[PDB]
Chain length 234, copies 4
Amino acid sequence: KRVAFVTGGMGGLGAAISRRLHDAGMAVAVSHSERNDHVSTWLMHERDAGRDFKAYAVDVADFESCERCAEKVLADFGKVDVLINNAGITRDATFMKMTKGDWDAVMRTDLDAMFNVTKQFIAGMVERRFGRIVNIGSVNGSRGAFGQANYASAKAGIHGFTKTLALETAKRGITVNTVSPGYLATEAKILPQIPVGRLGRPDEVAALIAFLCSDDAGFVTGADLAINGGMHMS
Amino acid sequence: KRVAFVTGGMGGLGAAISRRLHDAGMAVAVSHSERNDHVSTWLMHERDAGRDFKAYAVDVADFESCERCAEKVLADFGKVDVLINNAGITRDATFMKMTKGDWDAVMRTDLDAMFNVTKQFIAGMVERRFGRIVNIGSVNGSRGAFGQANYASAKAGIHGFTKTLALETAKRGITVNTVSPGYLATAMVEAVPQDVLEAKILPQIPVGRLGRPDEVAALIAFLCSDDAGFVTGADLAINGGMHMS
Amino acid sequence: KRVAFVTGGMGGLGAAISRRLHDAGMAVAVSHSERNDHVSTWLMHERDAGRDFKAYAVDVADFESCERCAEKVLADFGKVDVLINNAGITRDATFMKMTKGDWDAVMRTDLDAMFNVTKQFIAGMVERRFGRIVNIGSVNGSRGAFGQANYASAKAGIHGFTKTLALETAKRGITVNTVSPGYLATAVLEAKILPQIPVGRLGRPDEVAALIAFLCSDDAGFVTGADLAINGGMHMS
Amino acid sequence: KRVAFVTGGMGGLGAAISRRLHDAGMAVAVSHSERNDHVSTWLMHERDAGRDFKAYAVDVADFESCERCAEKVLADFGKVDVLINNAGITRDATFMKMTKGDWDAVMRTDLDAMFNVTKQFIAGMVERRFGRIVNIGSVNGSRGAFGQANYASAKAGIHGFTKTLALETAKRGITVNTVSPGYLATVPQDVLEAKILPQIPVGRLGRPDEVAALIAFLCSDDAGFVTGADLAINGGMHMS
Ligand SMILES: NC(=O)c1ccc[n+]([C@@H]2O[C@H](COP(=O)([O-])OP(=O)(O)OC[C@H]3O[C@@H](n4cnc5c(N)ncnc54)[C@H](OP(=O)(O)O)[C@@H]3O)[C@@H](O)[C@H]2O)c1
Ligand SMILES: NC(=O)c1ccc[n+]([C@@H]2O[C@H](COP(=O)([O-])OP(=O)(O)OC[C@H]3O[C@@H](n4cnc5c(N)ncnc54)[C@H](OP(=O)(O)O)[C@@H]3O)[C@@H](O)[C@H]2O)c1
Ligand SMILES: NC(=O)c1ccc[n+]([C@@H]2O[C@H](COP(=O)([O-])OP(=O)(O)OC[C@H]3O[C@@H](n4cnc5c(N)ncnc54)[C@H](OP(=O)(O)O)[C@@H]3O)[C@@H](O)[C@H]2O)c1
Ligand SMILES: NC(=O)c1ccc[n+]([C@@H]2O[C@H](COP(=O)([O-])OP(=O)(O)OC[C@H]3O[C@@H](n4cnc5c(N)ncnc54)[C@H](OP(=O)(O)O)[C@@H]3O)[C@@H](O)[C@H]2O)c1
């Protein structure tokens, strides 16, 4: 049985990913933040809907926290085959008004997490000669993003990580890809810039991610998969 | 019942696409070239494997041939919901040695087909407010390739077409995407000398193997599904790590 | 003394390119279309402003025409070191309404020119181990554009050509690059075009020509196979 | 008289940039690292070569250091029109062997610098309605970079910053661009010959002065319509 770990797995996109991977037959572990005030509630509602998840506290901005979390996940599941680096935040401000704290918080959570989280699971994937690592970027890592110098930098940086790790793991049965969603239903200045004329559904993005985590996607690696309603093309 | 039309549907990649779309529950029409000498045999083997396809002659480089083909497809199936522009050829030569015929043949088959084929089915998709158009590009459109000034140009041009048509159709429930494969296990690869396969082709591919047509077909089947309506104007790279950007 | 040949050298962008290359010290030849009705007027006014150009008729959509043109250029200048594939047209229509003639006209002029024109000058560049080939694309090849299924495809295809020819010529001292301008002040802008341009103005042909002059210089030999975007921020990726 | 500030202005690429901008007629200030032990000698040699530079200590990974540096630069020159974010380092390791220290050192120097340095100069450029901000990326922010998960992430992140700042400043006569050099003649010969040069179509390393010449064009009055762009100068090593 394939094991998936989804950071931010109780958030808007993360919950959709977790449900799709569970329905594809994977055993699914989710992370939750230290500040999360609804861990037991979320698990109960998912169980009522027919899905048993296990949850693990983590601060993806903190390497030692990721170590403690990974120890628990691996103790319970024995391995992680599929890693979704989905946790993320924004701290929007014009560059002129942006604080060092705004910058750092986004950098540490959205980009350092690539190192902090993936370091804990990569050795096992390499040892077993199988893995799927999916890093959640953003259309605003590609298009210019007003008021988001920190978020755009972190999200663009994610794809540099994806490409390096893809090259390093390509002969070990692992793929590493970036999925860059557009704006999700999770907005009178946004909708006009989306050609399909609607926000994206988290379940749609989750469906693409489930394909990438499947046995049919072993030839997709180092790629950036854009699912943005046409908002950005290049 | 969703209807798909796959150009080059009996070729290496096209056959894999046709099978995947059929297995997803679509009614599948395939094109074949006018001089294809094995059409009945191909249909019989697919029937033996449990899949009934209907096959239609076309020259995708010729607008009138595409018109005649589409007339017959629509007479049998009533509509086309899913169009896979997959037919394609190469005519490799260094630019110094490339002929006018080499250039025109690749441009007309590989790029003009975007116009010649898609024009025959776009109106119905627009009126029904649903469609999936998938154009097969190439990793060599993205990175360029020695000996392929014609082919890389045509394959790069395909994505310009994809982006424009995506913009024009986005409010009609249609998506238009480019799929750009790396080297695949088909006949083009199988005609390569073994030493060239080993020393020149495989070292280009980080995952260390050619891609299977069925893998590319699986990605295309996702794009043609009801879960991919938010993917449009994209270029989806499935190349084993051969190219990243 | 480097020789440049600029197709569409008398048009909006082409004239600015020709002036910049001349001012960089090159001997400049320009093409003109077969029915251009102001060739001698243009040449005289450029001479009045201090620049002696020579002009040559061509149809870049026709291989034979390009043969004849290159024959005349090479007879007068001896060689061509720098080739600017700048001639281009649009034939806008929604895809639903676009005709085969709309498609073919843009494809043959804008994309086939890569073959028809460059085939006539590539051998000399390879023989001399020096060359600069600059192909004019468009921001609309990068982002796609309503009504331009033909033009966006042709302009996107140009960069596929650039990358391949760059690979084939890189060990022979030749560079091949695409320059993709945004909307230019050439011959409703406040409501339709300008709001899409972050810098809030159209581009000047001379600005694009200045970038091209850099790419054609001895300082740009490490730029090849690139697509240089000069679009006022209209498209980023 | 246009004023330029070049971080890492005494390094391999940075010195070539500083010379080109000086020769274009700009007044040029360069940064140096805090423990750079050859500031006086470097300045003297440039002076003997006919170029008067002013040098300033900074740690681009530290916001307060950037503040002190910028205040002294602005006191001496009155303004900065042209900012070259060129300081940078590598800490190469395979991902399996890479430490948090390797990652943080590259992130803070190569990516946080975009914030730490540019924050000190942006207000003046906005007020004067002129600016050129050029951020030095890398071909390895575009192509896959084996053994450089940290450096590739930092360099790719730079272009996200470029594009945002380009959008926010475009109406104020400021351009912001990424320049992404390939491998430069600034490593064992066996690695150069087996791993690097075969992947560069032109078959040679780039010269720092070549990259500096492109940067000089981008900082000129002819480049005001180039913004939010990534300008690749890599010998053909990466195309897309
Ligand atoms: N929403 C969109 O339109 C959109 C578009 C493109 C990309 N994205 C990306 O999609 C991802 C998911 O975001 P979302 O839209 O689902 O927003 P969301 O509902 O706010 O979810 C963000 C998730 O991040 C987790 N998280 C944040 N900081 C964390 C930390 N330090 N340690 C551990 N977990 C942390 C949260 O955990 P808890 O729930 O446990 O507190 C939460 O589940 C993000 O990477 C975002 O950048 C979103
Ligand atoms: N193979 C790879 O490594 C690779 C990699 C990237 C992209 N691609 C693309 O994948 C697509 C399919 O190629 P393939 O590898 O499957 O090669 P293939 O086996 O040679 O198939 C090419 C197909 O094109 C059809 N065709 C060619 N010219 C035609 C014309 N004028 N009118 C109608 N049909 C025509 C052929 O039809 P008949 O069989 O009926 O004669 C054939 O089915 C092409 O677009 C190719 O560029 C291939
Ligand atoms: N203007 C913009 O906003 C813009 C933006 C991006 C890209 N571009 C590109 O810039 C280039 C120059 O166009 P422009 O803006 O300067 O427009 P333009 O003034 O209309 O110039 C087009 C040029 O193409 C030449 N030409 C057209 N068809 C030809 C043919 N079959 N054979 C030979 N010459 C032919 C014309 O020659 P004659 O003058 O001799 O008749 C003319 O000089 C084009 O490639 C265009 O796509 C323009
Ligand atoms: N060399 C290449 O092949 C190549 C290719 C692509 C991109 N690049 C980029 O080009 C830029 C310049 O590097 P280079 O090739 O010239 O290498 P270099 O000779 O090692 O110079 C790096 C520069 O960074 C400065 N620096 C490092 N950490 C600093 C800090 N914390 N605070 C202040 N200054 C600091 C150094 O200052 P001091 O000299 O004062 O100590 C030095 O001038 C870097 O961004 C690099 O990533 C280089």
